[PDB]
Every structure is written in structure tokens, then in C-alpha cells.
Design a protein around this ligand. Structure first.
Ligand SMILES: O=C(O)CCC(=O)C(=O)O
Ligand SMILES: O=C(O)CCC(=O)C(=O)O
Ligand SMILES: O=C(O)CCC(=O)C(=O)O
Ligand SMILES: O=C(O)CCC(=O)C(=O)O
Ligand SMILES: [Fe+3]
Ligand SMILES: [Fe+3]
Ligand SMILES: [Fe+3]
Ligand SMILES: [Fe+3]
Lengths: 280, 280, 280, 280
């Protein structure tokens, strides 16, 4: 995958076509924007969580008990895997927006930082979606991978077929959706983003029990031997931004004591490609 | 290879046994210390070079058109591969030290920063080697990889068999030597450190033309269907520290316009293992 | 010339107006400061050179066989007669500053010593010029006159019309510049500083091919019966400091085996006469 | 005059024939031995005088004029121009020896230093003459030139025709006598030794009233135009040693406030050239 930019956050202005290029033109596949947040910012935010001085965010922590101890714990309600009503999603999302502003102590505030990055890369306005009759979506979600845990293979564009999506399908240009995330703490080893070469293909994916078996099965029947995969491990405060709507991806198993705290969501164009919408 | 720590530079204090461990105990193979330098420092240093406002360092740049256009250009003379006199090495090394101190505007000074990091990791004293007749070795070297170029496969401990080494072998405990480097600028793609599992020794290394096709053997050497490799790409200000004395390694071909500027050298114990020596 | 003080370096404090006096008021013409350096220091420094234990200085020795065996060899690059770039000047100056500190083993360090003398004589601060893009100028230069050789007539203030001067002219008050030098070894005979009574006169000097013929030609057309000259021969560690910017001068042919080794440079005021600048 | 050595006191050992050479072979004319005494010693000795903490030497100071303000004040009796009895000479000579040993505080003792120097230069024993009836001669004499004063022209070898000499003529090999002196303090300008090229010539000297009009008168009658003279100015602790017995010589008029304090005497071979005698 030509998932390549590894850009200094500073020179982000040099790519005012970058989002349009990944989604629509598909000329490249993702970016690594280095230093979107100060490593200091990330360590104090990551410390708030670890103790409890967190603007009230322990109160939306959804350790995912009965999915086994092999998928990620997660602060705030992730819109993926929600009842199509969105009762509790719109609810936790307000808590998240507030508890987050607190923790970042405006040095620099999470939401505005991310917005200017997305702004500079698209040159369109950036908004978090307003719900049907005024609720707020959440701009992002903090994922917690404890040692041993991992996030399994999945694709962005399956969300377009999910009933919870039904509101946003009315707001969004139904292009590819992008993923983005910024690490608060990194693990000692592993726990790296792995993007597969293979594109969005629901028809053939569904015929497998667990979707990793689809990735494996492909990697046998394709035996050229380039590699089908490419893996990154962005450090604290480095943003990773990519066409996760299109490409199958995952996170490696976390090695060693220290967990992988990591905040982010998704990102896409809107109906008539005017605003840039970013949610989770 | 358990080339694994990915530590935040801040908590470098928690590992005061770390260097002895990589070299002497071989209990693990390397570290990535995140944020040894402020991203801000790294880009202004990189701007100084790129412009010319460089404390006079342009006068020791060695573009190596002597070797075809696939090896790195390099500021200051790297001690590896010099006539045993070290005349032109000791000279350029004096220029390096001043121009380098200059460029960092003591915010924070290169020699001082790196020294405290190596200190915290050993709790031994850290010194730059003084030459036979009072000269100075250079503490490091700025390597410049232009688009298309690369660094070929090699091992640190071959230096121990080299003529230019003859001085230091009197100064060093002849254990493993470590490599270390800090990226000033990162490329768009590629140009990543790849460390191979294959260890240092003198025998069948001698039997070739030379050495990337020692990563001939390397792969149909092994396999079950292992990894002979591990690959890293540290961002601006992130230090990479590893037992490159022991394991064969290289740097990927740099892809894309912007070049891979990178400052660093090597690192080892001293005759009766008290102070820690670091040079380039 | 009232080139007269022959002061014991000790009582140098008694003349805190001295530099302002020679340069600006021109109330007297120069000093001989006896014992700025220990005779022990001068013999051990000169022995480091003579052998090779020189902190790496042999590598900036510029024998000038390109000019006939009529002018002096010289360690380090003298700023006079340089391309206006100062690329190789600034480079050697870095080397010089290092090898010099080394050789003096801080007993007492060259730069520190010299600075305190210049300090006491002006009561202004003393600095070595930092260059346009962060380089260092050389605080001094070691001159080597072998037996038979000599230094030809010249004036300090021509440097003001030289293109290599273009940087410092922005830094200096464009007063007269003074010379200073301290003998490491003295020759058996000859090799003495000869300062002529004649003042700086570029227009009329330029009409001569060899500038000595200007000194001769004047000394015929003037014949009163005083003397036009005054000549000195300071022993090891004796500093000679005088207005060589204003007056024509030279060094006699060296007689006898032992060469005339001598370290020194020039000395001047700064733009708005605060700081004292000294270089070579 | 080949009055040339300007040797470092250290390497005085390299010339074990030098005294025999100046006196007997007349192969050269004199030496300047740099650093016989520490500048530190010289100024603390000079401070003792200037104050009064002088081991009692004020009691042999002969402010001298009886003779017009033409010649120098002088501590102790100089043997030249004495009653042939030597009663008052031998008496002041005892005083001088004690106050002098005193003032030097054995750091290094005057007699002992000078003796080792004369020793290294002859490889003969060195002694101060014991008088006829057990008295001592003085090893040296401290001369004091105040501002404006000077020493008139003279030759060493007239002393041989003087009645005050009659004793030593039984002691000395009647070769040439050398003069020697070491400055304790130097004046601001002038007050330098001038040795003329002209040799010892009593018959023709005696015909002039003032011995300078013999020097002027000669320098007119064979007007070629090299120079007939040579002039020296040794700093504190530098010894000047030369065949002043043979050549007419003098001291410049002292310029400026600070006087020219200076200790020294003469030096010659002994009857059957074994021992080296030195007195004043
Ligand atoms: O590592 C994360 O925070 C999530 C990775 C992922 O699957 C995504 O890009 O949404
Ligand atoms: O990245 C660099 O600066 C050179 C890499 C290398 O060969 C080393 O670390 O020893
Ligand atoms: O003797 C020297 O070192 C140089 C003399 C000279 O020309 C100067 O005073 O600058
Ligand atoms: O400076 C002196 O001590 C006197 C010089 C002199 O005439 C002598 O050497 O005897
Ligand atoms: Fe995802
Ligand atoms: Fe290497
Ligand atoms: Fe000069
Ligand atoms: Fe005399």
C-alpha cells in the first residue's frame, strides 16, 4: 500500500488536496502526521486517565467484558455497534466532548487541534455531526489495549451497511471514510497498526466466520511474494490518517506491561462535498 | 529479535541497567526512546543545514560520489573506514563539535542531551574519546540519504577488525558496540532501519563479493516461516539505540522527495567497564 | 615612535585607559608587557609543536612555498589575504581554537590569559568575533620563521580595504587595529620586530611594487639625523602590543638554527566602542 | 658584533664551551640567557629594596654624585675606581653578600643560581675571589638608574691598568673579562645596553677627554654604513653575558618614571685557567 507520507505536522499546509487525494482520487493511501500534539500534552492527558483527574471520564469507560479479554477496552460509546436509535451514544458523547476539553486544558484543546489539521489538508470547513434533533456525536474515542490484547481485522466501509449508520448516510457523501488516531501512550513492543493490501469486499468477507480467516486465506492463494501488508507504530502525539474505509486493518498484540492508550475516530466528506465531517 | 522497548524519554530514569543489559547480558536487543529531542529543535536544526546558516558545517560535508549514487552523503568524517592515522578524521571532528554545538543553540545542546540519556541508562560516566595526542573524536555524524539512496547491510563489530580502530581498542572493553541515531528529518516513505536476526562473526562472511547478498543465505537459511527481520522508523527527535554491533542491519531505500537527515554514531564500554564511551 | 611601556604584566592594572590611549588618543604607540605567560608554559607549548603532541594542530600548518622562501610558515589561516567567503578560514579557526586549548593544558589557557590582559588595559569586555552564520574567528595564529626567512614590510590598516574584511567591518569601530604577539621560542639573533615611524599611507605606498622600496625611498628623502625606526626583541612569554594598524612594520631575517615561533593576532574596538574584539 | 645567542636558560647545558669561546677563541661575542631568574623572584627582590625590607642593604647604597647627574646610584662598592687598599670595598662586600642572600630568601639564592649558570657554560668550578688577608670580594653590585640618568661609555679592560686591580691580577688569567647583569626592574623606555663594534684601545682612548668623543670620532672617520653598534634590553630575570672587557659599551638614558634596577658584575678565567672567578 502507498500509505506514505510521514509528514512533519508543520508542513501540513503543503498538502491542501491531501484528503481529496486519498478518498476520491485514491492517488495515495494514508499519512503519518508527526507531532500533531506535544509529547508533553499526551503524557499529562495519559496521566489524568491513569489516576482519576479526568473531567469525569471514568464514568463512560466500557471495558468489553463479554467479548472476551482479547478486544480493546474503550472510553465513550463507539458508534459502530450501536442500536440504530442511538440513545446512549448521543448521551456518552456529550460527556466525552466535555471531559476531553477538561483534560487537554486547552494546551492545545483536542478538538481544535485536530480540526485545523483536517482543515489544512482539505481546505473545507470541519464539523462534528449534529444528531437528528440536536444531539452531538462524539469527535473521537479513547481506546485502551492492555498487555496481551489486540484489535482484530475489520473494515471501515462495512459501517455503511450497519443500521446505526442510518442517520449519517443522510449527511455524508457516501465515499470512503478515513480513520485517524493519535497515541497517548505506546506499548513497549507490538501494538502496531497493520494495513492490508486487500480492498473492501463484503460479499466475500461474510463467507468467513471470523474475518481474519479471510485475510489469511487470501495470503495463500496470492502467493507472489511481495507482502500484502504494511505496519506502522507512530509515537506519542503522532497522528496516523488513512483510508481505513477501503483497506482491511488491525492492531498487533500488545507486548509488555505498558498499555496502548490511543484517541481517535473517523472522517469523511459531506453529501455535496462541502464540509468535512469527523466523528466516532 | 527482542529489539523492544519503545520508552518515553521521560521515563528513561527507570532503566539504569539498560545499557549493560543489551551489551553484556544480552537480555534484550535495543530501545526506542521517544522525545530525546523536542520536535521543534529538530526542524530548526534541519533548517540550518538546509539553508546554510550552519555554524560552518558545510565545509565538512562529504557527498560520496566516490562510491556511486546509492550510499549516503555525510557531514564530518565517520571513523569507520579511515587510514589508521585519523589525521583528517581528528580535524573534521573538531569542526563538527563546534558547528554542531552552534546549530543546536544550546536548546538543548546535542552532546549534553545524549550524554544524560546514556547516563541514565547506565549510571556510569559518559565521555567522548580523546585521541593519542590530545585530539577529539567526534561525538556523532549527520547522515544524509537522498531519494533513491540507501545504506547497505553491515555489522557494527567489523570495526573492531579495522585499521582506524587501532586507537580505541586500547580504550574500549572489546564487548559489543551499540549504534544510536536520532532523525532530524524523516522521508515520505522507506528509509527505515531493518535489524536482522543473523549475528556477528568472521568466517563465511569472508567468502563473498560483498555484503547485502549475505542476506542471501539469510532467508532460505532459516525458514520454517519465521521473521529474520524487524523494521523501525523513528520520528523527529525519537532516538533509536540498538546492538548493531551484534546484528546485521541496514536502512531502506529512501522513497520520495524529502531526504532522510539523521544524526548519530556508536557507543561502548571502556577497558575496565567504568565510564561509557560514545563516538562516531 | 613612543612605542614605550615595557610594563611588568603584573602591574597591567595600572593602565586601564591604555588601549583607548594608543588607538583613539594616539597619546602613545605600544607596550611591551613582560611575563604575560610563564617561560615554562612557552617552552612546553613550543615543545608540543616541535614534537607532535599538539592536540592535532600539525594539520593546519600552511607552509607557504607558493610565495618563495621569503615569507613565514604559519599554523592556522591568517584572515588577511583570504577570499571574501571565509569558508576555509572559519574551518581552520575551529581546529585552531581546539588544538590551542589542548596544548596549553590550562596552565594558563591561552585565550583566558590574553583576554584578561586586554581586559585590564581597556576595562571593556573582551570577545572573539562570532561569524556571519555562527562560525568562530581565530583568537590568534602561530607564526613560524625558519632560519634565513623574514616577514616583509606591511601595515595593519590595509586590511580595511581588503574584501576578506567585509564581515568584521560591520562589527568593528573602524579605528586603528592593534597587533599583539607573544614569542614561544626566540631565535639566536635577528628576527626582531621593527616598527617604522612612517604613518599609514595607501595612496603613495601602492605606487611601489615591493613595499620595502617605499620604506627606503622615504628614508632617503627625509634625511635629518634622528632615526626613522625602533626595534624590539621580546623574550618567551613577553607580550608585545602596539599600533601596527597605523605604522609600517616587519620582522628581521632570522639568524641561526633555532626558529622564531610566535603566537598572536590583532585587536580592536567595536562599532559603538563597548566590547573589545581580538582575532587573527 | 656576533653578540648573539638569546638562549633559553634551560638549555644553558648545551654550551659547555661558551665562556672559553667568548674569552679565548673570540669566536663570538656574548649571550642573552633568558629566564635565569623567575620574574616573580625579581619583582619581590625589587620590592624589598624599594620598601626597606632589604636585609640591611640601605646601609651600603652609594648615591653617586660627587660626579654630576651623569652616572648611576649603586648598592655596594664597585671595585673599579677604588683606593688600591680595598679597605672599604672589602667591608661593603661583606655587607652586600649577607643582605643579598637575605633578600632572595633562597628562592633561588642569587649566588647559587648565577654560579650554576657560569658553571654550565664553562664546566669549570666557579668562585668569588677571597682577598689577600681573608676578606671577600662582592659577587655582584646593584645599579640604580633614575629617570634621565645613564651610564657613560667604558671598557672592561681598563681595570687591568688600574691600581685597585693589583690583587686580582695575581688571581686571574689575564685574558678578557666578561660583564654580566640581570635586570630586576626595567624602565618604561630606553636604558638599554649598547655595545660598540670598536675594540679595546687604551692608547688612543686616553687622548680624549670624555670617552664618548672617541666613539663619535671613530664613527665618522671610516664612513661605510653598516652599523657599528648593537643594543639590547633584557627583561626581568634575563641575564645578559658578554665580552664587555673587549668592546666599548654603555647604557641608554632612562626614559620615564620607573628606574632601571639591575644586579650584576664581572667574570674571568683564573691564573692557570681552572676555576672561574666572578666578582664586582
Ligand atoms: O488503534 C486504534 O485506535 C484504532 C485503529 C482502527 O481500527 C481505526 O483506525 O479506526
Ligand atoms: O541511520 C543512520 O544514521 C545509520 C544507520 C546505521 O548504519 C547504524 O545505526 O549504525
Ligand atoms: O611576529 C609576528 O608574529 C608578527 C609580527 C607582525 O607583523 C604583527 O605585529 O602583526
Ligand atoms: O646595567 C648595568 O648593571 C651596567 C652595565 C655595564 O656597564 C656592565 O655590564 O658592566
Ligand atoms: Fe478502524
Ligand atoms: Fe551501522
Ligand atoms: Fe602585522
Ligand atoms: Fe660595564
Amino acid at each position: 500500500a502507498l500509505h506514505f507520507l510521514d509528514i512533519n505536522a508543520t508542513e501540513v499546509k503543503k498538502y491542501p488536496t491531501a484528503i481529496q487525494d486519498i478518498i476520491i482520487n485514491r492517488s495515495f493511501d494514508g499519512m503519518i502526521i508527526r507531532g500533531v500534539f506535544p509529547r508533553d500534552t499526551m503524557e499529562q492527558v495519559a496521566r489524568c486517565l491513569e489516576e482519576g483527574n479526568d473531567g469525569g471520564m471514568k464514568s463512560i469507560l466500557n471495558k468489553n467484558e463479554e467479548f472476551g479479554t482479547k478486544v480493546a477496552q474503550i472510553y465513550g460509546h463507539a458508534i459502530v455497534g450501536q442500536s440504530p436509535d442511538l440513545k446512549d451514544y448521543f448521551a456518552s458523547s456529550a460527556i466525552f466532548r466535555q471531559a476531553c476539553r477538561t483534560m487537554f486544558q486547552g494546551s492545545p484543546d483536542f478538538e481544535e487541534q485536530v480540526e485545523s489539521i483536517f482543515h489544512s489538508l482539505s481546505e473545507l470547513p470541519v464539523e462534528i455531526p449534529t444528531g437528528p434533533e440536536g444531539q452531538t456525536y462524539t469527535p473521537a474515542t479513547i481506546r485502551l489495549l492492555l498487555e496481551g490484547r489486540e484489535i482484530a481485522v475489520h473494515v471501515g466501509n462495512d459501517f455503511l451497511l450497519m443500521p446505526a449508520a442510518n442517520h449519517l448516510k443522510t449527511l455524508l457523501d457516501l465515499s470512503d471514510q478515513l480513520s485517524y488516531f493519535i497515541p497517548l501512550t505506546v506499548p513497549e513492543a507490538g501494538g502496531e497498526l497493520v494495513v492490508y493490501s486487500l480492498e473492501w469486499n463484503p460479499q466475500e468477507a461474510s463467507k468467513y466466520a471470523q474475518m481474519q480467516e479471510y485475510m489469511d486465506d487470501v495470503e495463500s492463494k496470492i502467493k507472489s511474494n511481495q507482502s500484502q501488508s504494511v505496519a506502522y507504530a507512530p509515537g506519542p502525539g503522532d497522528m496516523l490518517l488513512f483510508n481505513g474505509g477501503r483497506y482491511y486493518h488491525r492492531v498487533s498484540e500488545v507486548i509488555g506491561n505498558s498499555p496502548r492508550r490511543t484517541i481517535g475516530g473517523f472522517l469523511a466528506f459531506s453529501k455535496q462535498r462541502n464540509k468535512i465531517y469527523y466523528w466516532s
